[PDB]
Design a protein around this ligand. Structure first.
Ligand SMILES: CCCCCCCCCC(=O)CC(=O)N[C@H]1CCOC1=O
Ligand SMILES: CCCCCCCCCC(=O)CC(=O)N[C@H]1CCOC1=O
Ligand code: NA
Lengths: 223, 233
């Protein structure tokens, strides 16, 4: 092999863009789509994805906000297994996107990501059961680097540090404890509980303790 | 693969699960193994479920001292998300931890963390006493191990979610699911009814039901429990 060596060197979007464009081809593919859904906000999480799909297709996919209906994408949220694969489908087919393999991997900071390698001429148990275990391997290492790149812009809270105390205040808040209940549990004063929470809210750029707690959890800060 | 898939669709018991891992451990050139999963509830202190064939005196200390919450390999698995080759001799901190493991032959390890359904986080470790895991042996078994760990995990997960993740059987309707999304972010019942153009009393109706299904005494608990299980998003 020789990819961890390329990655440990890669430090930009294009370097990632072209490092996948080569893997795309070196395994018989023309289209590639690496996507990543942030955990925030909960009510409309924001995806981020580079590709090489037809320009006309990129723009229209956004236009109608297809992320909220795309089955290739819904899978990447409920299932942890790879997937060899409505006027929506019709609108796509006629662009060169009908034959492709999507690989969903969970990553740091609660990021849910997917490598969807598509081609313009399908399934092959002798090609799948042949590259199956690699494709998956590549994907995990792709997402690792990809997150280390996106986390900055995409999950700005990723470099948040949480004091021991704040971590413990957030955990008891995750379970719905009032400032008063936490004190009796921790044998500590009330203004004390509020103090630490209020600090974490700020670092975590949240309007309130529930949003904070949720953001902290969603990122692994309470793990 | 030689029908691991078949051997794995059969597995219905823990001891069955135990022997598959043990054969893999042996077949793949190691000596000890562990496999465990971390359930997400309660969020205050998640519980771990694991087995190994480590020397009995280490099993006992590992459980006694609650090492799941100290073991750096476990921290890596939760916090980063990738496979890791390690050598107990190398670590500079946690010597009280590492010396004792070195003492029992737990020196060269290969660990593969993975995420699965219901907020279950799992990890296979293959370990041996001598002969370090080198670039070549990895070049060879790496992909297979990463795959078999995905497999092993879905099993361990379907095999145990029941007692491990009690609220994992829960189903939420579109409305309950949206009330929780807005609750996670701290909206009140009044704000949610305005936001969705439905009566406050109905917002309440659905959250109360969502609370009862997820066995929570408060909407905040319910929301977070729902989140961890993948019910939201
Ligand atoms: C892991 C959950 C999704 C993370 C974000 C992915 C966004 C990428 C959107 C996308 O292009 C989906 C995709 O690859 N499907 C193709 C196939 C047919 O029509 C498409 O747009
Ligand atoms: C992140 C998911 C973790 C799943 C829980 C698995 C618990 C089993 C922990 C374990 O025994 C790992 C391990 O082998 N640690 C080694 C390292 C040195 O001493 C050990 O016991
Ligand atoms: Na982007």
């Amino acid at each position: 092999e020789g990819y961890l060596e390329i990655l440990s060197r890669i430090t930009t979007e294009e370097e990632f863009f072209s490092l996948v464009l080569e893997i795309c081809g070196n395994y018989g593919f023309e289209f590639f789509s690496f996507g990543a859904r942030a955990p925030f906000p909960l009510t409309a999480p924001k995806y981020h994805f580079l590709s090489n799909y037809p320009g006309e297709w990129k723009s229209r996919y956004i236009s109608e906000d297809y992320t909220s209906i795309d089955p290739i994408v819904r899978h990447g949220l409920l299932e942890y297994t790879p997937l060899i694969w409505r006027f929506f489908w019709e609108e796509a087919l006629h662009h060169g996107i009908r034959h492709g393999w999507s690989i969903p991997v969970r990553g740091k900071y609660g990021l849910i990501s997917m490598l969807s390698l598509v081609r313009s001429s399908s399934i092959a148990a002798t090609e799948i059961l042949e590259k199956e275990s690699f494709l998956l391997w590549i994907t995990s290492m792709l997402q690792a680097t990809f997150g280390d790149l996106l986390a900055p812009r995409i999950v700005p809270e990723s470099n948040v540090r949480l004091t021991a105390r704040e971590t413990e205040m957030l955990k008891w808040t995750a379970v719905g404890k009032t400032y008063g209940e936490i004190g009796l549990i921790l044998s500590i004063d009330q203004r004390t509980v509020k103090f630490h929470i209020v600090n974490a809210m700020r670092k975590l750029n949240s309007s309130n303790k529930a949003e904070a707690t949720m953001k902290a959890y969603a990122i692994g800060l309470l793990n």
